[PDB]
Symmetry: D2
Subunit: 124 residues, 4 copies
Amino acid sequence: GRDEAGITGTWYNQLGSTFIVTAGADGALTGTYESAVGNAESRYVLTGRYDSAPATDGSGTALGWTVAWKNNYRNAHSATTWSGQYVGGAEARINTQWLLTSGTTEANAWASTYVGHDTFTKVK
Amino acid sequence: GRDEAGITGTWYNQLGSTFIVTAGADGALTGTYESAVGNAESRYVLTGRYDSAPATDGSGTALGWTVAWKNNYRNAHSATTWSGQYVGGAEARINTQWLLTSGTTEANAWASTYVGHDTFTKVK
Amino acid sequence: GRDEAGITGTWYNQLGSTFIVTAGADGALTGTYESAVGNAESRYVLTGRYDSAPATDGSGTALGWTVAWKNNYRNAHSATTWSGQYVGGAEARINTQWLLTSGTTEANAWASTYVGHDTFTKVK
Amino acid sequence: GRDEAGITGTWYNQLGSTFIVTAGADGALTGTYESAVGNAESRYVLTGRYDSAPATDGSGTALGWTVAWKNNYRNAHSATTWSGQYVGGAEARINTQWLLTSGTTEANAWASTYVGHDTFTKVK
C-alpha cells in the first residue's frame, strides 16, 4: 500500500491511549489497543482495513478498525469501531470518529451506543 | 465463543447487502461484504471482532467490523465500520450503527463521514 | 412551508415516545416531547427548524429539533438532538438519527454522547 | 439559568464559523449561524435548548441547537443539529458533535446524514 510504511507503528490519542498497528500490503490492519480510560486494562486485539491504493490528489487514506473489550484481565461486553483517515507528512495524523456498542437487553438497546472522536499522532 | 455458531453464516440487511462472516473461537470476525448500494461491486474483504464470552443475563453480544471499499473491480477511497450487537433466537438479528469515512482533502474533511444504521437478519 | 401541514401534529416513534410539533411558515418547529424510556417523565419543551421550501424532485424535507431533559418534575442534565427528514404520503414518516449529550466532568467527557435512530409515524 | 450569562454571546469554531446565541432563563437558545464551509452564505436562523439548572459537581451544561440551511440567499435542503456541553471558565468552550441530514430520495437515504464534531470558543 502507498501508506503501508506511514501507518505501521505506534500511535497515541488525546486521552493517552496507545494504538500499535501493522498495515499489510493486502489492506489489513492488525495490532493491539490500550485504552487510558473506561473499563479496560492492558492490551486488546484489534483488526481492521485500509485503502492500500489511495487517491494521489492530496486526499487522506480511509481506514477503520475494531476492538472487542475482552482480554485475559477483563470483559467490558462492548466493542468500539474507529472510522477515519490517515493524513501523512511532518505532523502525521489519523483523524477518527468512533462508535462504542455495549451488549444490552432489548429494553436498554436505545442507549447501547456511544459516539466520539479521537485524533492519533506519532508523538506523546 | 458462546455465539460463534449463532454469528457464523450469511446475513442480509434492509438494503439487500450480503454479509458473509466466520466467528473464530478467539473473538475474530473474517469474511466478505457485498453492498447493494453506493460505489461498490462484488465482494470486499472484512475483518472485525466480537465478545466471545458475553453476559448470561439476556444481553446481546457486542461486535464490530470494517470494510475498506477497494477490491479488484473498484476503489471508492472509503471505509465503513459497523458497531453493534448480535441478538440470538428464532428471529436472530445483528443491530448496527455505522460510520463511512472517505479520504478527503483537509478543506473537505468536515464532510468526510456518513453515519447510518443497518439491521441484519438470516433471511432475505 | 410546502410540508407545514404534513409535519404539524402528533407523532410516535418505535419506543412509544410522543412528539407533538407545530411547523411555522418561517421554518420553526415548536412543541413538546414525551419519552417512553430513560430519565424522563411527562412533557419537555422542544424547538427546531425545517426546510420550508424543499426540493420538488421527490426528496424528503430536512429538519431537526432539540430537547433539554429538564422540566418541573426531573432534570437528567442532558439534551438530545434529532436530525432527519420528513417523507410525506399515505404512510408518512420522519426518519431521524439522534445525539444525546450529558453534562460530564472533563475526565468522563469521552463517554458524554449516545447515538441512535428513531422512526416517527402518525399512528401508534 | 446558572450559565445563561456564560452561554449568551458570539462563539467561533475550528472552521471559522460564527455562532451568535442568546440563552433564555426558560432554557431557550435563539440566534444565528454563519458557516465558513459548505453550501452556505450569510446568517441562518437557529433555535435550541440548554439545561438551565446544571449539576454543581463541576460537570458541563448540556445543550443543543438546529440550523435548517435555508435563508434569503440559498437553500441547501439540509439541517444540522449540534449536541454538546458548555464548559465554563477562563478558556470557555462548547464541545459538540453534529448530524447534518439532507433531503434525499428513498434510494439515497442510506447516505443522507453526515456526522462530525465542532469545538466553539469565545476567541478567534
